[PDB]
Design a binder for this molecule. Structure first.
Ligand SMILES: CC(C)(O)CC(C)(C)O
Ligand SMILES: [Mg+2]
Length: 423
């Protein structure tokens, strides 16, 4: 009787069974690296004299196509990456501006149910939306992965969030996950896989599911995971066909009599629009109880969201209420080029433009970085981001409220923190 994570790690280590706390050596299906972890990893490999990665088709590299105009080190790192990709015969390499980190990997078909996914970023948990075991690892582990196609993992315990009921109007999976995190706390799920399931999750789209697993790490989770269903299978198969990345996969599900460290019953019909308020993702408040505070900027589409359903719900709110308030900069960033195209074809982009919204291209590098330069001092911002920028948020006592795309759009409309149901 095993959880989905246990089964995935059992299969991957060739074991009959696995229990939390077991330390097992698991085959890696896909390893993703972007920005600096790329050059660290390649360098470590050079130092050990490793001529070849284990499988050039199970490595996904995101890297800036533009040579950085000043620093010679980054031009050097850039030449290094191109050499590696070429010599190793790495098939799957993408511009850092193909999309935000965690959008590009699944949309090209690189994440299937039952797979072990490792990534250089803290928010690789995102890919657990696909019934995959997905974790962020450092460059030392990443070099080991590139060399051998294996890594030691400690099997985590699972907390199961059973989410049932129907989401009320104007409420999204962003509000569900934020509400879960306000209760559990930034450290409440340390070492644990956070599994979301239940009738409410079944009805959610893949896009909505990804927003939840995206933020598992924000409560100290080891990862986030949702079992695959028909929507999952069809998304993955369609993505594989579009990009030529077909490979066999096994849909793995947890057992009905699996053990969990904890089980939360989440009443979805009770979730309301919420904000994560400065300065902790933990500090979650019902929108009404903060409503009224004037705001300077709104970011709709961020790390990792701004998929088509996010852009729809945002543009519907804005266009219905006649555009955006005065003295609010509203930046709209589709999660990927592929998502940008879908929005373009549906006339959504043209409409954001019409209301004086800035529409900008996504960049994986933006998710990793400093917010120095984007927010002015003392400015209040509403963001659909699913990750914190603590430490380097940044410029410097700027205030940043995390919200769903619906609430973010509402805020853009009124020019203040507002509950979208109150427009
Ligand atoms: C990446 C970003 C520009 O969306 C972050 C934020 C916090 C300003 O939304
Ligand atoms: Mg992210």
């Amino acid at each position: 009787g095993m959880t989905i994570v246990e089964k995935i790690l059992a299969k991957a280590s060739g074991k009959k069974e696995v229990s939390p706390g077991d330390i097992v050596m698991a085959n890696i299906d896909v390893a993703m690296v972007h920005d600096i972890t790329g050059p660290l990893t390649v360098n470590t490999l050079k130092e050990y004299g490793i001529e070849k990665v284990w499988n050039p088709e199970k490595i996904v590299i995101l890297f800036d196509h533009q040579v950085p105009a000043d620093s010679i080190k980054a031009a050097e790192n850039h030449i290094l990456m191109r050499k590696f990709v070429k010599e190793q015969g790495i098939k799957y390499f993408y511009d850092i501006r193909e999309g935000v980190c965690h959008q590009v990997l699944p949309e090209k078909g690189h994440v299937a149910p039952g797979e072990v996914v490792v990534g250089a970023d803290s928010h690789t948990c995102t890919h657990g939306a696909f019934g995959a075991f997905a974790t962020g690892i450092g460059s030392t582990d990443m070099a080991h992965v590139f060399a051998t196609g294996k890594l030691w993992f400690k099997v985590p315990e699972t907390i199961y969030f059973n989410i049932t009921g129907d989401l009320q109007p104007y409420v999204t999976s962003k509000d569900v996950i934020l509400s879960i995190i306000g209760e559990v706390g930034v450290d409440g799920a340390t070492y644990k896989a956070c599994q979301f399931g239940g009738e409410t999750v079944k009805k959610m789209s893949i896009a909505s599911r990804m927003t939840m697993t995206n933020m598992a790490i924000e409560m100290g989770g080891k990862t986030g995971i949702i079992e695959p269903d028909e929507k999952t299978i069809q998304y993955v198969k369609e993505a594989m066909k579009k990009h030529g990345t077909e490979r066999p996969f096994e849909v793995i599900k947890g057992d009905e009599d699996a053990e969990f460290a904890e089980v939360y019953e989440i009443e979805a019909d009770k979730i309301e629009p919420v904000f994560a308020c400065p300065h902790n993702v933990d500090n979650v408040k019902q929108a009404r109880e903060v409503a009224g505070k004037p705001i300077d900027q709104v970011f709709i589409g961020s790390c990792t969201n701004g998929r088509l359903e996010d852009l729809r719900m945002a543009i519907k709110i804005i266009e219905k209420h006649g555009g955006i308030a005065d003295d609010v900069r509203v930046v709209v960033t589709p999660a990927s080029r592929e998502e940008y195209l879908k929005a373009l074809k549906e006339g959504i982009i043209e409409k954001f433009l019409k209301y004086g919204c800035v529409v900008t291209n996504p960049s994986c590098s933006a998710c990793m970085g400093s917010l120095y330069g984007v927010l002015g001092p003392g400015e209040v911002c509403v963001s659909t981001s699913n990750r914190n920028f603590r430490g380097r948020q940044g410029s410097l006592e700027a205030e940043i409220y995390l919200a769903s795309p619906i609430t973010a759009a509402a805020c853009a409309v009124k020019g203040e923190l507002v509950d979208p149901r109150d427009l």
